[PDB]
Structures are given as C-alpha cells and as structure tokens.
Amino acid sequence: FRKSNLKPFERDISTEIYQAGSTPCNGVEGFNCYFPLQSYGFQPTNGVG
Amino acid sequence: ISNCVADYSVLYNSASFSTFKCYGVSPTKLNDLCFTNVYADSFVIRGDE
DSSP: OSOOOOOTTTOOOOOEEEEESOOOOSOOOOOEESOOOOOOOOSSSOOOO | OSSOOOOOOOHHOOOOOOEEHHHHHHHHHSOOOOOOOOOOOOOOOOTTT
C-alpha cells in the first residue's frame, strides 16, 4: 500500500499504517486501515511461479 | 444486474460489513473501470464458516 507511486532509483522505509476511508488511524489500526509489510510464503510444496 | 451506474459509496466507506476486499481487483478505486455484467448472490451463513 502507498499513497502515490515511487520515483526512479528511490527507496523509502516507513512502517506507518495506510488509511483509505474516513477514519484517522494514527498509531492504532482499524477499519479502512492496513499494515503494509505483509510477507511471502515460500514452500517446497509448490511449482514454478 | 445490468444497465447500471454503480455508486459504491455505501458498500466501501459507509460500510457496516465484516469484510470488504476483492480478489484480483483493487477494492479502493474500483469506480474507474467497468465490465459487461455483475451479479448478486445471497445465502445464509453463520459467522464462523
């Protein structure tokens, strides 16, 4: 999740929480509010892809 | 449900629903694309399944 797109050769680490709707989400999660860094699942129970 | 203009105001941000998320479609700006037809199924499921 991000408010806007990235510019070339840029990197930005900010573990804020991402709001979409009509709720102030400052530090506390809730409705229309998400946490960006959701991880990968890598298993040898899979195929290529 | 055909021949509509679909105002997703009350479904997205005025919502009272246990979830709102769509597979393969970003459910935040779903207004600015459209499709041939969309349907509505309704069944009666208890809050665990």
